[PDB]
């Protein structure tokens, strides 16, 4: 029995709003709930102003909880895979590493000033994706209680938006692929047999990330085609029809979840 | 025996084990003990390869090791 790739699993960086040299790194399948636990309590600690935290960045797209924890622990250790400047440089170092490169992760910033420091790449550490929230926060004002609260509330809304949207997009895309399978008249791009659930090799399918592209195949067939120092996992294969770049991790995400 | 030769050998063992190959390109976690047992069963030479080298190979090949 295969385990599904998580709908969402991310490794996040928190920066205290008031204590701006305090950071925290963790990993989670639900960053909204997690940020409430960090800012309030774990379940229903004297306060020294470390809370509330701002979630300033999150790396997500991990193929498993295990992989996210590997990234988290490497990021915290600072690791065999190799100030705010150092925390952000560690992200780039890990995204360049052979192991995490296969995952085509997404680095998302909720704060534009933090994104700018990362981009400035002070240490010249420079397939992963980088994104920045619409209405990302910029310079933080922590001079008053109301300013601190305003930052916390706006940051929560940004984290909610990214998370709920990511889940809604995967939901929508799963439904569209399922409809393709359900028609039972698609055929495999490579072996030409009808696409139908009937043998893991026969029931795992691969789709183009463009839902209006008609490329569909057996996962095994796509794997074979893409794979023709030696490697095992495809890296940035292109759709044989529209030539767009695919993320193998996303291909597997939908493949396994449709079968389950 | 160079590390390149060992890595090629281990990769070739994986490619001859269909179930394990599919699990790896589907990013499925596997314990080191389970992996080494599957490899050794394809070629007993795996017995002579140290754990640290096997772990370097798993990192390079993107194999996810579950403790
Ligand atoms: Cl929630
Ligand atoms: Cl506190
Ligand atoms: Zn096929
Ligand atoms: Zn396509």
Curated annotation (Swiss-Prot), chain A:
Annotated compartments: Nucleus
CDD domains: GIY-YIG_SLX1
Residue ranges of domain GIY-YIG in the record: 7-82
Keywords on record: DNA damage, DNA recombination, DNA repair, Endonuclease, Hydrolase, Metal-binding, Nuclease, Nucleus, Zinc, Zinc-finger
Its EC number(s): 3.1.-.-
Cofactor: a divalent metal cation
GO BP field: DNA-templated DNA replication; double-strand break repair via homologous recombination
GO molecular function: 5'-flap endonuclease activity; crossover junction DNA endonuclease activity; zinc ion binding
Name of a matching Pfam family: SLX1_C
Function: Catalytic subunit of the SLX1-SLX4 structure-specific endonuclease that resolves DNA secondary structures generated during DNA repair and recombination. Has endonuclease activity towards branched DNA substrates, introducing single-strand cuts in duplex DNA close to junctions with ss-DNA.
Assembly description: Forms a heterodimer with SLX4.
Annotated family: Belongs to the SLX1 family.
Name of the protein described by the UniProt record: Structure-specific endonuclease subunit SLX1
Organism lineage string: Eukaryota, Fungi, Dikarya, Ascomycota, Saccharomycotina
Designated gene of the protein: SLX1
UniProtKB/Swiss-Prot annotation, chain B:
Subcellular location per the Swiss-Prot or TrEMBL entry: Nucleus
Family label: Belongs to the SLX4 family.
Changes after translation: Phosphorylated in response to DNA damage.
Domain of life: Eukaryota
TM annotation in the entry: none
Positions in coiled-coil regions: none
Function: Regulatory subunit of the SLX1-SLX4 structure-specific endonuclease that resolves DNA secondary structures generated during DNA repair and recombination. Has endonuclease activity towards branched DNA substrates, introducing single-strand cuts in duplex DNA close to junctions with ss-DNA.
Organism: Candida glabrata (strain ATCC 2001 / BCRC 20586 / JCM 3761 / NBRC 0622 / NRRL Y-65 / CBS 138)
Protein's recorded name: Structure-specific endonuclease subunit SLX4
Assembly mode: Forms a heterodimer with SLX1.
